[PDB]
Structure formats: C-alpha cells, structure tokens
Design a protein around this ligand. Structure first.
Ligand SMILES: CCCCCCCC/C=C/CCCCCCCC(=O)OC[C@H](O)CO
Ligand SMILES: CCCCCCCC/C=C\CCCCCCCC(=O)OC[C@H](O)CO
Ligand SMILES: CCCCCCCC/C=C\CCCCCCCC(=O)OC[C@H](O)CO
Ligand SMILES: CCCCCCCC/C=C\CCCCCCCC(=O)OC[C@H](O)CO
Ligand SMILES: CCCCCCCC/C=C\CCCCCCCC(=O)OC[C@H](O)CO
Ligand SMILES: CCCCCCCC/C=C\CCCCCCCC(=O)OC[C@H](O)CO
Ligand SMILES: CCCCCCCC/C=C\CCCCCCCC(=O)OC[C@H](O)CO
Ligand SMILES: CCCCCCCC/C=C\CCCCCCCC(=O)OC[C@H](O)CO
Ligand SMILES: CCCCCCCC/C=C\CCCCCCCC(=O)OC[C@H](O)CO
Lengths: 6, 207
C-alpha cells in the first residue's frame, strides 16, 4: 500500500 | 488530503524552520540536543526512500525534499558550523537504547517483511521517541529558552493533528494504519507534561 502521508 | 493533515504538515514545517532560523541567526546551538536532530534526520532518510518508487504529488515530493534538506542542515549547524556552542556535556541521552530496540521491533512487527516497508516501520517507531534526547536535556539543564519552547509546541502539535487526520480518514475513507496510529499516540503522550507547562507557564510569561 502506497504511502500518501508524510 | 484534509485540513487536519495539512495543518499538521504546516505545523511540522513551522517547527523545523523555527529551530533552523534560531540556530542560524544567533550563531549558536546552546540548549539544543544534537542527538534528537540526528534521530529526526534518520527518520526522514528511512521514511522517504519511496521518493525513488512513488510519485504522490508535487506537494508530497517537495515536502519530503524540504524535510530532508532542513534536517540535514540542522545537523550540519550543530555538529560542524556552530560546534563551539554545542553542549555535548548536557546532551547525554544514550540513543542506543532507542535505535537498537526500535530496529528490532521494525523487523518483527510490520505490515510486510520487505526492505522498504521494514525501513518505513523503523521511521514510524523512531519518530515516536526522537524528541526524548531534547526533553531529557531540558530536564537536566536549566529550563528552556522561549523560542525553543515554540519549536517544541509546533512539533508536538503536528503529530497530534495527524491523530485527528486518522479519525477523519477512518470515518470518510475506511482507511486505518494501526502501526502509524499506536506510534502516533506514543509520540503525542510524550509531550503531555511539556504541553501542560507551555500553556500554564510559557503562554502566561512564566518559566
Ligand atoms: C513515559 C515516560 C517518559 C516520559 C518522558 C517525557 C516527559 C519529559 C521528561 C523527559 C526526561 C527524560 C527522562 C528519561 C526517561 C526515559 C524514557 C524512556 O525510555 O521511555 C521509553 C518510551 O518512550 C515510553 O513510552
Ligand atoms: C489550501 C488548499 C489545499 C488544496 C488541497 C487539494 C487536495 C485535493 C484532494 O482532496 O485530493 C486530491 C486527489 O488525488 C484527487 O481527489
Ligand atoms: C519565533 C517563533 C515564531 C512562532 C510562530 C510560528 C508561526 C506559526 C506557524 C504555523 C501555523 C501552524 C498551524 C497551527 C496554528 C496554531 C496557532 C497557535 O496556537 O499559536 C499560538 C502558539 O502557541 C505560538 O505561541
Ligand atoms: C524567526 C522566524 C520563525 C517563523 C517561521 C515560520 C515558518 C512558516 C512555516 C511554514 C511555511 C508554509 C506556509 C503556511 C504557514 C503560515 C504560517 C503563518 O501565517 O505565519 C505567519 C507568522 O509566522 C505568524 O506568527
Ligand atoms: C520494545 C518495546 C516493547 C513493544 C512490545 C509490543 C509490540 C507489539 C505491539 C502491539 C500488540 C499488537 C499486535 C502486534 C502484531 C503482533 C505480531 C504479528 O501479528 O505478526 C505477524 C506479522 O506479519 C509480523 O510483522
Ligand atoms: C529505555 C528505552 C526503551 C525502549 C523504547 C522503545 C520505543 C518504541 C516506541 C513505540 C513503538 C510502539 C508501536 C507498537 C507497535 C504497534 C503494533 C500494531 O498494532 O500492529 C498491528 C500490525 O498491523 C501488525 O503487523
Ligand atoms: C484545523 C486544526 C487547527 C488546530 C489549532 C489548534 C490550536 C491549539 C493551540 C493551543 C492549545 C494547546 C493545546 C495542547 C496541544 C494539542 C495536543 C493535545 O494535547 O491534544 C490533542 C489531542 O491529542 C488530539 O487527539
Ligand atoms: C476491525 C479493526 C478496526 C480498527 C479500527 C481502527 C481505527 C483507527 C482510527 C483512528 C484512531 C485515532 C486514535 C485517536 C486517539 C485519541 C486520543 C488522543 O488524543 O490520544 C493522544 C493523547 O493521549 C492525548 O493526551
Ligand atoms: C495537555 C493540555 C494542557 C492544557 C492546560 C490547561 C490549563 C489549566 C489551567 C491552570 C492550571 C493551574 C496552574 C497553576 C500554576
């Protein structure tokens, strides 16, 4: 699952 | 993106700039834990390795590059440029008690046993305890300068806003990441005494 946060 | 994560990110960038400009203008890193800055630089280095595998947005790429640059520049100012004012004698937290167990835990408790995911997990657990050397230095030495407390306030508020962001995303998108959440709760709980003292003393012109 691609990380969309920092 | 939602307003809680955006404010959270802006609060984090604020803290990073407050500290960097404070050391730069004063030409001194007195009262600052170099150890905490090394841990934050290690967090961004292990978390943002995806910069080579993924593109989320221009904002996401730029923020990652800005965080890495500012964290490495802060480390440079403390350990190289303004090394004469680095209080090594009071920045004595043994960071091996954080790195070695967090390292062990990231390999053992993760969403996937793959190098990039393990390193991302390490960044999440390490960030939860990364400020401990700074809070430890403050407790050892005499208090904290006002600009240093503002840095700690915006840094602590950032991950607290991420918790609100996760409630929002769970409700509206059905998305949840228990590793990020638990570690985020740990990250925020460690600021409890600082928050109480910042509101009751610092915001009232005391300490
Ligand atoms: C939860 C207990 C820790 C509260 C600290 C925040 C309060 C500010 C004081 C810092 C002085 C630091 C003294 C050194 C204490 C070591 C703490 C430690 O190893 O904590 C492991 C983990 O973070 C546990 O959740
Ligand atoms: C300040 C406003 C910032 C505007 C932020 C715009 C966020 C766009 C958004 O909510 O989602 C992008 C998604 O990839 C497509 O829906
Ligand atoms: C030299 C120190 C300058 C310190 C000022 C930095 C500018 C604020 C930056 C970003 C807003 C981040 C979003 C969060 C908004 C919260 C506003 C707030 O509570 O501000 C009072 C704070 O405690 C302050 O004293
Ligand atoms: C000595 C200087 C210390 C201050 C360093 C501030 C860092 C600004 C943070 C992020 C830029 C992203 C833009 C969004 C944040 C806007 C915050 C704002 O309105 O700041 C005005 C002022 O700082 C209210 O005191
Ligand atoms: C060193 C500090 C002490 C920390 C000690 C607590 C660590 C576990 C945390 C919470 C329990 C929630 C369950 C966590 C997952 C358990 C293992 C599991 O299910 O592992 C399969 C997975 O594939 C393997 O990554
Ligand atoms: C003296 C120094 C003491 C050492 C200080 C170590 C600090 C570690 C802190 C926080 C990480 C806590 C995160 C716990 C992991 C949550 C696990 C979980 O919920 O896992 C579900 C997952 O989906 C299953 O793979
Ligand atoms: C859009 C969001 C904008 C938010 C602007 C907020 C300004 C708060 C400022 C000062 C009071 C300090 C309060 C203590 C710091 C907050 C963190 C906290 O203690 O609790 C939050 C809780 O954990 C969450 O789940
Ligand atoms: C079937 C499995 C279902 C799993 C469902 C998972 C849902 C995860 C979403 C949000 C949690 C957000 C946590 C918010 C914690 C709020 C308390 C808080 O603010 O804690 C910080 C500190 O204690 C303040 O002093
Ligand atoms: C974590 C959020 C912290 C919120 C702080 C709320 C302010 C409480 C006011 C006065 C206490 C008495 C002070 C006596 C000295």
């Amino acid at each position: 699952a691609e990380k969309d946060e920092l | 993106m939602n307003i809680f994560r955006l404010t959270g990110d802006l609060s984090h960038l604020a803290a990073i700039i407050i500290l960097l400009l404070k050391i730069w203008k004063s030409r001194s890193c007195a009262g600052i834990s170099g150890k905490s800055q090394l841990l934050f630089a290690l967090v961004f280095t292990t978390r943002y390795l995806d910069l080579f595998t993924s593109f989320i947005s221009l904002y996401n790429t730029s923020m990652k590059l800005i965080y890495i640059a500012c964290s490495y520049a802060t480390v440079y100012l403390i350990y190289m440029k303004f090394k004469a004012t680095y209080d090594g004698n009071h920045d004595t937290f043994r960071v091996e008690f954080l790195i070695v167990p967090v390292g062990g835990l990231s390999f053992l408790v993760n969403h996937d046993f793959s190098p990039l995911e393990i390193l991302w997990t390490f960044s999440i657990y390490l960030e939860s305890v990364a400020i401990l050397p700074q809070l430890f230095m403050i407790s050892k030495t005499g208090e904290a300068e006002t600009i240093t407390t503002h840095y700690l306030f915006f840094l602590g508020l950032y991950r607290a806003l991420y918790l609100v962001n996760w409630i929002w995303r769970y409700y509206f998108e059905g998305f949840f990441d228990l590793i990020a959440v638990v570690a985020g709760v740990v990250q925020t709980v460690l600021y409890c005494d600082f928050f109480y003292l910042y509101v009751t003393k610092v915001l009232k012109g005391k300490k």
